[PDB]
């Protein structure tokens, strides 16, 4: 009962369909984002386990502009649609104002787009929650977008499956003093705490964002990092 | 505004059917650019058609008017577009095209023989449609219509041979006294048997 | 059960039931066979005379969709007639845009995708009929294609759709249709129709023929009558 | 007859979809506003108590709609974002027409019209957001306004929406110096109200979002209270209840 | 065991069957008997007006459509009057464009298409009226009957409406001698066909029979009450 | 309006399960298995090959016109598995999109971009209320210029990914296991350690040796980058090459 | 602008100049006016450059899509009809005169001559563009039937040289293309290779 | 660059007596300086009691006469009676005005019997200002015809003359003579004279000859 | 014959403001017709029917007209998810800058008025 409509508030007044997209995200593939003092790292967990699968084709830590990148945990196709329209929004803003889009504004616009499916009838909310990194005039930014359209600003957070224990792991492992080179390492540790399969070369995808802009780490650099 | 035009179409009734003719040329202004085009259609087994004016619009009509004939013959009920029906449909099409200030720059001469009674209709770019035993378009209306009407007022009913010869004489007159004309014309004749187009026919004059 | 109220619904085992009822709907209509031979394709239907009050020629099932293309249907007469009308528009559009006649293999793909396009929406329902397109042209010989309500389009040497497609297919398999002419194929078609027909339930039918091919200059036509009587007879002494 | 379609009257008159919309409000953070003679404050409970959060920037439930008037939200926060955007746009539109800042009732009614349009012709979820408005205008001075997902609204001298709303309003009714209170006397009253509507957790500046509005020198001032002022207000109320023993 | 499938027209029964269409047939069985036999030269439509109200003039079964096409309705009055307007529009447009009477056998196909369109879309109902079309064109008389199933038939004689099976049996027993009949005998045969539907206790009075004839030289003329005395008189007892 | 969202967790497309899993999408996956056909695609470093069954359960049917290898553009070809009508419709969509890409961007569409476009289109079906996922999965192949030989696969969920060698159909998981053992073992696959690999996979997973009438092979090579369907003879040649030892 | 095409036995030979004037100034003097619609089908563009270029691109789009759908090389008449439609619906907004010519398996070498306006007519030889007026007489006097590929090329080169020496909107290098069953054999006649006729 | 209009010429004339309503017109179809045909009558029969006669641009004449016939059939279908003369005139005014910004270049005169059987004639303009008159003439030669009709029918400017009611025979004589006179001076009028006599017994047509030049 | 809405007339206007008034304002429908004619002619009637059939049910439920809308699924159904033009940056519907009463704008969408 009442778990059928997406436009029917429960007698308890809580939207059960968005309640379910949260479960879809929680049943996804883990992702971790960390704000270091001079940059942001996004790392994600790859389900392309079989050797036949390729890395040269599909990517998860996928860029928006010279200085904003995403990572998700949920349904891949819904991601791809969301990243396509985030690119639209960034370019729209850049045409209107000759200015790289602020991270917060891109987050707000994407969150509005995501909410626009939460209250329409005859559609479904996106089955993904986004983690967004950016760098705007000398301070890092990290945001998480809820499928309901809510968005939050996190110093460091974990998402996807087994996230509550990743959230607790980041607790007594994070502070102001950590910086990007150490942030990479602690994010890797956070992932392997629940990796379930003892990572190698490309079991993960990592992205960074300092003033050199958003950059996806090549597998060789990740290999360098897994050495310690 | 037209670019490639045709000069004149002649047509005269006779006892048993209708004979019409039109020369084979398209003028790109004062230039005889295309010298083997045909400006005579066979609509169905009882009605032909000729046209002067823009030739691209005539080809558009060939596309459309041809298509309705197939569209009805597939039905296989047996009713067919009588010559008067094609004339009315064409009149309506060009009146509608005129009312939108995008006229079909043409002046057709529909001729047909159905139900034992001949038929000859005229439609121009402005939807001026009527019927007459003898028709002419362009400077045909000044150089060939007078001879046709002179011959018809004395003898009102013509045989096949006299009508064909009269058309040939009028074509000689047009060839002499019309700038945008060619000495290779087509004659299309309809009888009970069906549409018949002979061509090309020259004009061996003295 | 429960997963069969709309075309936009996959059954738990992965079967769109509301297109499989339609493919099972045509088994309510009488059979229709069409055989392809060296010179052309000839159709033939177990046309039912519902009552003697009907004119000889009501409920035709052998529509002409274009000069060189035929059509024999089976299923709901209304929906099949609507599809015949739709195909009549594809041929016209192709002629208007490209000048020459529409290839049969292309027409069967233009319409099959249309029947399919009604099989994936909750608003509309799938067409409840199957039909055979037949044609001949010196460029490409004779072709025959069949379209089930699901939208699957395949070309056939011998086809049969209706309530007794199985017996008809079994009997068609007994001819060397690749080595025969329409003149000798019409006789076999009438033979098949009477063999497959079940008289006990369906007295008073009207055998209805049509061929298009070399011997008719590639124009679709209902069979000239005297041939229809010779085939009628030939099927009769054999039975 | 029942809970569906947001466009059905139950056989008893009650729009059940809207009654459920005014249920999500009973779970969001407590938000209250108090009207004083010389200003207006708009306090709110910031229930994002998690420590890994950042970006304390000006607001999480206290938005600014134009040069004069500000807003607060409660309920589904995404719909609240949509509504705040619409409010800002409406205020700018009125300013574009008449070249004066919009009177507060004008904007409140303009929004309530949309919120009611969603509890009518539709087929869509009604906005499950209950707002609070604080602002100034030359027509009536300081004003405070409430709204429900139903599209209803009303001017309140002192109110509260969200969690523990009933106890807060009861204390405010029994506790209010109606018509003759200054600003930070009302600030002390608001701290007392929130101290009434705590969870088990004792409140601190990390759990409160007081904001104030002021009529000064011809320009309207909305300064969100910083850390130190809030902690000092908290110690003040703490001593006051201590000696109240 | 088919209650889920017999509510919407866009739902096939799990038997290859649309129940809604078959229920649209059942509207035709709720009208009143009407007969549409034809001869070599003429076509007639004999219909029995509804004696269901009293003291109020009976309904109007036979409808003028054009100078050469007439119709008889045996279904929902709403759908009947909605289809007759479309028929009139088609005939008017045909005379406007081609300046020729619209052939019957093409108007009937247009009806078939227009009545098939609703049979497939959601939120619509099939046109619950069965027609009887009498017409004359270049190929002489025609009698086409239309069903709510968007299926039109070419008929040498047909009856639709309540108890029309009796009339169909009678016509089937007398179809051969219909081609060679003067107008009088044709109308008498049609009147008899309509008569074999009624209960034996009542006879065809002048206030419930609505002969309408079209043919070679006669335009489609509707004969209402007392004017149908010439046709009805001379009709022998059962 | 439309028939309405069928009431149920698995009744409809957009409705979400309690742990957030679309069901009609997965039933669409299990609709691929209808037909019984299975397909295999592998690539060497200079050729990409797709091999599928050609099951004709009748002799009246024109074997020439029954097929599952369609040519999208001159350099891109696909093999469709699943319900036939949806497969052919998606081929139409692929051809249109690939021609449109060349029209708008002036160069042949790379295989990845085509597969991504079609995955995007197919995902949209998994979000509205009467469109239905096409029960058919695509396997594209081709050479772009430098990226290398590529073999991609769509699916009704809208997912797509890169494959060194893939398979689809009923006997798919076992084919995946065999093909994984293939790639683990030795991966030159010039042109011969190719197709013998695909045919060997299809046979060893399916049944005893095929004979040339049941196999449909299309190839693209680096020095011949046009989709060529192998004729009945040369397929038979590779078949004896299996037998010939 | 003196595009030219001739149908020989078994194929077609195109021909065009290379000169794109924007008044009296030569904006581009090595223009390639032989846009390949398909593998063995060509068009020649005359008139406003933008309209012809856009029309050729639209037609190559539609024709490539059609060829893929039919799984066959397209007939030249199909490309001619596709050009006719676009040039006729927008006859007011366009200033294109196209000389569609190519080869197909069915009808052999074909030359269609869609002028400004939307006509579609077949020609044994078709010429167009501004300079064609100065070689109408030459082509009428010299064309014969059954010409081979080589003398067709020589005829085309002569006609184009005659036009370019006279017309100011025509000059530069002569681009030829000999479409046949095997494939196109393009060539450019430049400088000395252009036939020269002794001025008095 | 395209003249959407052309003047084909043609003259019409109507007389309303007591039991009749004459509608007459020449049958010459002209254009510029050419005679398209000599047997194109410009009077059309609408109803057993009403006859319209149009003149001017022939294309609009054809279109208008077909629209009018269609509208009579629609009226007959909806209202179940043939239209009266006044109703047809009012409809025609409305139809003409619907193209106020693209006018029907036609001059129309309705001649027939009203509800009580007395004659009635309605005269129009290219955009539909109609009125009842006892007689009228429109078209190219209207300027030649109207003064003579004013003199002989309306007895204008004559003194001490008995106002005899206009008889049908005298009406025919008058119409034939006025068109004989008009054919002499107007180049657009001649080659025949179709006269429609609308009486209570139907519509009977007489046609005579004019100057053929 | 009324007002309180800007006397909805524009009859004086009629003729376009420019040869680039109606065409540029409705190039969305113009491109729809271009692609449909491309697909009717070559692909079939099924493809334009699909496009109409879908575009219907992407617009039925996006948001009420008096609020801004993004229309996501429509954009990646046409090529517009990676092709952005002058209709996206100039006077975006987000800041529509002119609105009427909500109700009065959501009714006409369906067409009550």
PDB file of C-alpha atoms in Angstrom, chain H:
ATOM      1  CA  UNK H   1       4.787  40.082 -59.241  1.00  0.00           C
ATOM      2  CA  UNK H   2       1.619  37.942 -59.391  1.00  0.00           C
ATOM      3  CA  UNK H   3      -1.786  39.597 -59.964  1.00  0.00           C
ATOM      4  CA  UNK H   4      -4.105  37.417 -57.877  1.00  0.00           C
ATOM      5  CA  UNK H   5      -6.978  38.927 -59.848  1.00  0.00           C
ATOM      6  CA  UNK H   6      -8.038  39.300 -63.459  1.00  0.00           C
ATOM      7  CA  UNK H   7     -11.167  40.809 -64.988  1.00  0.00           C
ATOM      8  CA  UNK H   8     -13.011  38.379 -67.242  1.00  0.00           C
ATOM      9  CA  UNK H   9     -15.923  40.703 -67.989  1.00  0.00           C
ATOM     10  CA  UNK H  10     -19.570  39.835 -68.319  1.00  0.00           C
ATOM     11  CA  UNK H  11     -22.842  41.659 -67.696  1.00  0.00           C
ATOM     12  CA  UNK H  12     -25.845  40.660 -65.592  1.00  0.00           C
ATOM     13  CA  UNK H  13     -29.288  42.161 -65.107  1.00  0.00           C
ATOM     14  CA  UNK H  14     -32.274  41.399 -62.900  1.00  0.00           C
ATOM     15  CA  UNK H  15     -35.883  42.560 -62.873  1.00  0.00           C
ATOM     16  CA  UNK H  16     -38.394  41.860 -60.111  1.00  0.00           C
ATOM     17  CA  UNK H  17     -42.012  41.932 -61.192  1.00  0.00           C
ATOM     18  CA  UNK H  18     -45.042  40.577 -59.369  1.00  0.00           C
ATOM     19  CA  UNK H  19     -44.996  36.892 -60.346  1.00  0.00           C
ATOM     20  CA  UNK H  20     -41.501  36.540 -61.792  1.00  0.00           C
ATOM     21  CA  UNK H  21     -37.887  37.582 -61.452  1.00  0.00           C
ATOM     22  CA  UNK H  22     -35.842  37.870 -64.632  1.00  0.00           C
ATOM     23  CA  UNK H  23     -32.139  37.106 -64.396  1.00  0.00           C
ATOM     24  CA  UNK H  24     -30.208  37.550 -67.625  1.00  0.00           C
ATOM     25  CA  UNK H  25     -26.558  37.643 -68.586  1.00  0.00           C
ATOM     26  CA  UNK H  26     -24.329  37.662 -71.612  1.00  0.00           C
ATOM     27  CA  UNK H  27     -22.228  34.558 -72.199  1.00  0.00           C
ATOM     28  CA  UNK H  28     -18.913  35.972 -73.395  1.00  0.00           C
ATOM     29  CA  UNK H  29     -15.831  35.151 -71.334  1.00  0.00           C
ATOM     30  CA  UNK H  30     -13.067  37.662 -71.991  1.00  0.00           C
ATOM     31  CA  UNK H  31      -9.564  38.432 -70.779  1.00  0.00           C
ATOM     32  CA  UNK H  32      -7.633  41.523 -71.741  1.00  0.00           C
ATOM     33  CA  UNK H  33      -8.127  41.590 -75.507  1.00  0.00           C
ATOM     34  CA  UNK H  34      -9.176  37.997 -76.171  1.00  0.00           C
ATOM     35  CA  UNK H  35     -12.350  35.935 -76.159  1.00  0.00           C
ATOM     36  CA  UNK H  36     -11.827  32.689 -74.280  1.00  0.00           C
ATOM     37  CA  UNK H  37     -15.261  31.386 -75.249  1.00  0.00           C
ATOM     38  CA  UNK H  38     -18.673  32.564 -76.411  1.00  0.00           C
ATOM     39  CA  UNK H  39     -20.830  30.015 -74.545  1.00  0.00           C
ATOM     40  CA  UNK H  40     -20.062  30.528 -70.844  1.00  0.00           C
ATOM     41  CA  UNK H  41     -23.358  31.551 -69.221  1.00  0.00           C
ATOM     42  CA  UNK H  42     -23.087  33.626 -66.059  1.00  0.00           C
ATOM     43  CA  UNK H  43     -26.439  32.695 -64.483  1.00  0.00           C
ATOM     44  CA  UNK H  44     -26.591  29.659 -62.204  1.00  0.00           C
ATOM     45  CA  UNK H  45     -29.698  27.957 -60.863  1.00  0.00           C
ATOM     46  CA  UNK H  46     -29.620  27.590 -57.086  1.00  0.00           C
ATOM     47  CA  UNK H  47     -33.144  26.603 -56.043  1.00  0.00           C
ATOM     48  CA  UNK H  48     -36.459  26.036 -57.816  1.00  0.00           C
ATOM     49  CA  UNK H  49     -37.317  29.601 -56.740  1.00  0.00           C
ATOM     50  CA  UNK H  50     -33.944  31.397 -56.642  1.00  0.00           C
ATOM     51  CA  UNK H  51     -31.343  32.088 -59.326  1.00  0.00           C
ATOM     52  CA  UNK H  52     -27.958  33.737 -58.807  1.00  0.00           C
ATOM     53  CA  UNK H  53     -25.926  35.457 -61.485  1.00  0.00           C
ATOM     54  CA  UNK H  54     -22.264  36.279 -60.921  1.00  0.00           C
ATOM     55  CA  UNK H  55     -19.932  38.441 -62.975  1.00  0.00           C
ATOM     56  CA  UNK H  56     -16.329  39.542 -62.730  1.00  0.00           C
ATOM     57  CA  UNK H  57     -13.311  37.333 -62.055  1.00  0.00           C
ATOM     58  CA  UNK H  58     -14.347  33.913 -63.320  1.00  0.00           C
ATOM     59  CA  UNK H  59     -12.293  31.886 -60.853  1.00  0.00           C
ATOM     60  CA  UNK H  60     -14.063  33.441 -57.903  1.00  0.00           C
ATOM     61  CA  UNK H  61     -17.352  33.031 -59.765  1.00  0.00           C
ATOM     62  CA  UNK H  62     -16.795  29.280 -59.953  1.00  0.00           C
ATOM     63  CA  UNK H  63     -15.584  29.004 -56.364  1.00  0.00           C
ATOM     64  CA  UNK H  64     -18.429  31.125 -55.012  1.00  0.00           C
ATOM     65  CA  UNK H  65     -21.123  29.278 -56.927  1.00  0.00           C
ATOM     66  CA  UNK H  66     -19.799  25.967 -55.641  1.00  0.00           C
ATOM     67  CA  UNK H  67     -19.561  27.199 -52.048  1.00  0.00           C
ATOM     68  CA  UNK H  68     -23.126  28.466 -52.316  1.00  0.00           C
ATOM     69  CA  UNK H  69     -24.458  25.151 -53.612  1.00  0.00           C
ATOM     70  CA  UNK H  70     -22.664  23.313 -50.821  1.00  0.00           C
ATOM     71  CA  UNK H  71     -24.145  25.695 -48.264  1.00  0.00           C
ATOM     72  CA  UNK H  72     -27.671  25.159 -49.587  1.00  0.00           C
ATOM     73  CA  UNK H  73     -27.181  21.425 -49.206  1.00  0.00           C
ATOM     74  CA  UNK H  74     -25.886  21.855 -45.652  1.00  0.00           C
ATOM     75  CA  UNK H  75     -28.875  24.051 -44.801  1.00  0.00           C
ATOM     76  CA  UNK H  76     -31.236  21.489 -46.302  1.00  0.00           C
ATOM     77  CA  UNK H  77     -29.625  18.772 -44.208  1.00  0.00           C
ATOM     78  CA  UNK H  78     -29.584  20.592 -40.877  1.00  0.00           C
ATOM     79  CA  UNK H  79     -32.857  22.529 -41.092  1.00  0.00           C
ATOM     80  CA  UNK H  80     -34.896  20.214 -43.356  1.00  0.00           C
ATOM     81  CA  UNK H  81     -36.143  22.819 -45.815  1.00  0.00           C
ATOM     82  CA  UNK H  82     -34.913  24.583 -48.920  1.00  0.00           C
ATOM     83  CA  UNK H  83     -33.658  28.080 -48.190  1.00  0.00           C
ATOM     84  CA  UNK H  84     -35.759  31.131 -48.909  1.00  0.00           C
ATOM     85  CA  UNK H  85     -34.425  33.884 -51.149  1.00  0.00           C
ATOM     86  CA  UNK H  86     -33.762  36.277 -48.281  1.00  0.00           C
ATOM     87  CA  UNK H  87     -31.905  33.631 -46.307  1.00  0.00           C
ATOM     88  CA  UNK H  88     -29.701  32.879 -49.311  1.00  0.00           C
ATOM     89  CA  UNK H  89     -28.974  36.573 -49.753  1.00  0.00           C
ATOM     90  CA  UNK H  90     -28.009  36.988 -46.100  1.00  0.00           C
ATOM     91  CA  UNK H  91     -25.775  33.930 -46.314  1.00  0.00           C
ATOM     92  CA  UNK H  92     -24.124  35.319 -49.416  1.00  0.00           C
ATOM     93  CA  UNK H  93     -23.415  38.613 -47.691  1.00  0.00           C
ATOM     94  CA  UNK H  94     -21.825  36.734 -44.807  1.00  0.00           C
ATOM     95  CA  UNK H  95     -19.770  34.525 -47.138  1.00  0.00           C
ATOM     96  CA  UNK H  96     -18.526  37.498 -49.131  1.00  0.00           C
ATOM     97  CA  UNK H  97     -17.528  39.371 -45.994  1.00  0.00           C
ATOM     98  CA  UNK H  98     -15.511  36.427 -44.653  1.00  0.00           C
ATOM     99  CA  UNK H  99     -12.903  37.368 -47.279  1.00  0.00           C
ATOM    100  CA  UNK H 100     -12.960  41.078 -46.440  1.00  0.00           C
ATOM    101  CA  UNK H 101      -9.156  41.207 -46.649  1.00  0.00           C
ATOM    102  CA  UNK H 102      -8.936  39.089 -49.832  1.00  0.00           C
ATOM    103  CA  UNK H 103     -12.190  39.944 -51.556  1.00  0.00           C
ATOM    104  CA  UNK H 104     -14.208  37.842 -53.955  1.00  0.00           C
ATOM    105  CA  UNK H 105     -13.921  39.972 -57.097  1.00  0.00           C
ATOM    106  CA  UNK H 106     -17.456  39.090 -58.177  1.00  0.00           C
ATOM    107  CA  UNK H 107     -20.661  41.080 -58.620  1.00  0.00           C
ATOM    108  CA  UNK H 108     -23.729  39.081 -57.634  1.00  0.00           C
ATOM    109  CA  UNK H 109     -27.443  39.628 -58.135  1.00  0.00           C
ATOM    110  CA  UNK H 110     -30.011  37.258 -56.621  1.00  0.00           C
ATOM    111  CA  UNK H 111     -33.270  36.970 -58.509  1.00  0.00           C
ATOM    112  CA  UNK H 112     -36.212  34.900 -57.393  1.00  0.00           C
ATOM    113  CA  UNK H 113     -39.449  34.678 -55.468  1.00  0.00           C
ATOM    114  CA  UNK H 114     -39.726  35.480 -51.782  1.00  0.00           C
ATOM    115  CA  UNK H 115     -41.887  33.579 -49.304  1.00  0.00           C
ATOM    116  CA  UNK H 116     -45.190  34.979 -50.595  1.00  0.00           C
ATOM    117  CA  UNK H 117     -44.405  34.390 -54.268  1.00  0.00           C
ATOM    118  CA  UNK H 118     -43.803  38.001 -55.227  1.00  0.00           C
ATOM    119  CA  UNK H 119     -40.640  38.774 -57.131  1.00  0.00           C
ATOM    120  CA  UNK H 120     -37.538  39.986 -55.345  1.00  0.00           C
ATOM    121  CA  UNK H 121     -34.044  40.961 -56.453  1.00  0.00           C
ATOM    122  CA  UNK H 122     -31.014  41.402 -54.197  1.00  0.00           C
ATOM    123  CA  UNK H 123     -27.931  43.290 -55.386  1.00  0.00           C
ATOM    124  CA  UNK H 124     -24.504  42.743 -53.835  1.00  0.00           C
ATOM    125  CA  UNK H 125     -20.974  44.132 -53.876  1.00  0.00           C
ATOM    126  CA  UNK H 126     -17.570  42.421 -53.718  1.00  0.00           C
ATOM    127  CA  UNK H 127     -17.712  42.339 -49.902  1.00  0.00           C
ATOM    128  CA  UNK H 128     -21.374  41.716 -49.259  1.00  0.00           C
ATOM    129  CA  UNK H 129     -23.533  44.794 -48.787  1.00  0.00           C
ATOM    130  CA  UNK H 130     -26.852  43.519 -50.105  1.00  0.00           C
ATOM    131  CA  UNK H 131     -30.199  45.236 -50.505  1.00  0.00           C
ATOM    132  CA  UNK H 132     -33.577  44.679 -52.096  1.00  0.00           C
ATOM    133  CA  UNK H 133     -34.236  46.437 -55.394  1.00  0.00           C
ATOM    134  CA  UNK H 134     -36.920  46.230 -58.045  1.00  0.00           C
ATOM    135  CA  UNK H 135     -34.247  45.908 -60.758  1.00  0.00           C
ATOM    136  CA  UNK H 136     -30.492  46.077 -61.167  1.00  0.00           C
ATOM    137  CA  UNK H 137     -27.553  45.531 -63.481  1.00  0.00           C
ATOM    138  CA  UNK H 138     -23.954  44.714 -62.655  1.00  0.00           C
ATOM    139  CA  UNK H 139     -20.693  43.952 -64.365  1.00  0.00           C
ATOM    140  CA  UNK H 140     -18.844  45.729 -67.153  1.00  0.00           C
ATOM    141  CA  UNK H 141     -21.933  47.178 -68.855  1.00  0.00           C
ATOM    142  CA  UNK H 142     -23.848  48.057 -65.683  1.00  0.00           C
ATOM    143  CA  UNK H 143     -23.242  51.742 -66.322  1.00  0.00           C
ATOM    144  CA  UNK H 144     -24.904  51.436 -69.728  1.00  0.00           C
ATOM    145  CA  UNK H 145     -27.881  49.411 -68.475  1.00  0.00           C
ATOM    146  CA  UNK H 146     -28.875  51.038 -65.198  1.00  0.00           C
ATOM    147  CA  UNK H 147     -30.004  54.476 -66.500  1.00  0.00           C
ATOM    148  CA  UNK H 148     -32.213  52.896 -69.142  1.00  0.00           C
ATOM    149  CA  UNK H 149     -33.777  50.600 -66.560  1.00  0.00           C
ATOM    150  CA  UNK H 150     -34.353  53.593 -64.288  1.00  0.00           C
ATOM    151  CA  UNK H 151     -36.171  55.284 -67.142  1.00  0.00           C
ATOM    152  CA  UNK H 152     -38.285  52.399 -68.373  1.00  0.00           C
ATOM    153  CA  UNK H 153     -39.022  50.423 -65.195  1.00  0.00           C
ATOM    154  CA  UNK H 154     -38.872  53.055 -62.464  1.00  0.00           C
ATOM    155  CA  UNK H 155     -40.346  55.748 -64.735  1.00  0.00           C
ATOM    156  CA  UNK H 156     -37.777  58.220 -63.433  1.00  0.00           C
ATOM    157  CA  UNK H 157     -37.787  61.756 -64.854  1.00  0.00           C
ATOM    158  CA  UNK H 158     -40.976  61.247 -66.883  1.00  0.00           C
ATOM    159  CA  UNK H 159     -44.157  63.201 -66.210  1.00  0.00           C
ATOM    160  CA  UNK H 160     -47.848  62.433 -66.709  1.00  0.00           C
ATOM    161  CA  UNK H 161     -47.363  58.743 -67.521  1.00  0.00           C
ATOM    162  CA  UNK H 162     -49.463  55.829 -66.311  1.00  0.00           C
ATOM    163  CA  UNK H 163     -47.512  53.520 -64.002  1.00  0.00           C
ATOM    164  CA  UNK H 164     -48.535  50.252 -65.613  1.00  0.00           C
ATOM    165  CA  UNK H 165     -47.362  47.181 -63.670  1.00  0.00           C
ATOM    166  CA  UNK H 166     -44.523  45.470 -65.490  1.00  0.00           C
ATOM    167  CA  UNK H 167     -45.734  42.421 -67.396  1.00  0.00           C
ATOM    168  CA  UNK H 168     -43.626  39.354 -68.111  1.00  0.00           C
ATOM    169  CA  UNK H 169     -43.805  39.818 -71.879  1.00  0.00           C
ATOM    170  CA  UNK H 170     -42.795  43.463 -71.599  1.00  0.00           C
ATOM    171  CA  UNK H 171     -40.013  42.454 -69.215  1.00  0.00           C
ATOM    172  CA  UNK H 172     -38.607  40.024 -71.781  1.00  0.00           C
ATOM    173  CA  UNK H 173     -38.877  42.634 -74.523  1.00  0.00           C
ATOM    174  CA  UNK H 174     -37.114  45.177 -72.328  1.00  0.00           C
ATOM    175  CA  UNK H 175     -34.251  42.882 -71.335  1.00  0.00           C
ATOM    176  CA  UNK H 176     -33.647  41.720 -74.891  1.00  0.00           C
ATOM    177  CA  UNK H 177     -33.641  45.287 -76.178  1.00  0.00           C
ATOM    178  CA  UNK H 178     -31.362  46.646 -73.468  1.00  0.00           C
ATOM    179  CA  UNK H 179     -28.817  43.928 -74.175  1.00  0.00           C
ATOM    180  CA  UNK H 180     -29.115  44.562 -77.907  1.00  0.00           C
ATOM    181  CA  UNK H 181     -28.226  48.178 -77.158  1.00  0.00           C
ATOM    182  CA  UNK H 182     -25.443  47.236 -74.735  1.00  0.00           C
ATOM    183  CA  UNK H 183     -23.800  44.781 -77.129  1.00  0.00           C
ATOM    184  CA  UNK H 184     -23.332  47.695 -79.507  1.00  0.00           C
ATOM    185  CA  UNK H 185     -21.150  49.913 -77.313  1.00  0.00           C
ATOM    186  CA  UNK H 186     -19.577  47.616 -74.705  1.00  0.00           C
ATOM    187  CA  UNK H 187     -16.813  45.344 -75.945  1.00  0.00           C
ATOM    188  CA  UNK H 188     -17.219  42.818 -73.119  1.00  0.00           C
ATOM    189  CA  UNK H 189     -20.861  42.010 -73.917  1.00  0.00           C
ATOM    190  CA  UNK H 190     -22.178  39.809 -76.692  1.00  0.00           C
ATOM    191  CA  UNK H 191     -22.166  36.423 -78.440  1.00  0.00           C
ATOM    192  CA  UNK H 192     -25.419  35.259 -76.719  1.00  0.00           C
ATOM    193  CA  UNK H 193     -27.974  36.150 -74.038  1.00  0.00           C
ATOM    194  CA  UNK H 194     -29.068  33.561 -71.478  1.00  0.00           C
ATOM    195  CA  UNK H 195     -32.273  34.718 -69.781  1.00  0.00           C
ATOM    196  CA  UNK H 196     -33.690  32.860 -66.784  1.00  0.00           C
ATOM    197  CA  UNK H 197     -37.370  33.427 -66.003  1.00  0.00           C
ATOM    198  CA  UNK H 198     -38.039  32.531 -62.377  1.00  0.00           C
ATOM    199  CA  UNK H 199     -41.766  31.953 -61.888  1.00  0.00           C
ATOM    200  CA  UNK H 200     -43.954  29.891 -59.587  1.00  0.00           C
ATOM    201  CA  UNK H 201     -43.920  27.090 -62.185  1.00  0.00           C
ATOM    202  CA  UNK H 202     -40.147  26.600 -62.192  1.00  0.00           C
ATOM    203  CA  UNK H 203     -37.267  28.119 -64.109  1.00  0.00           C
ATOM    204  CA  UNK H 204     -37.407  28.291 -67.901  1.00  0.00           C
ATOM    205  CA  UNK H 205     -34.493  29.542 -69.976  1.00  0.00           C
ATOM    206  CA  UNK H 206     -34.507  31.571 -73.179  1.00  0.00           C
ATOM    207  CA  UNK H 207     -31.350  32.370 -75.116  1.00  0.00           C
ATOM    208  CA  UNK H 208     -30.986  34.785 -78.020  1.00  0.00           C
ATOM    209  CA  UNK H 209     -28.117  36.079 -80.162  1.00  0.00           C
ATOM    210  CA  UNK H 210     -26.163  39.341 -79.990  1.00  0.00           C
ATOM    211  CA  UNK H 211     -23.418  40.904 -82.082  1.00  0.00           C
ATOM    212  CA  UNK H 212     -20.742  38.267 -82.554  1.00  0.00           C
ATOM    213  CA  UNK H 213     -17.859  40.718 -83.027  1.00  0.00           C
TER     214      UNK H 213
END
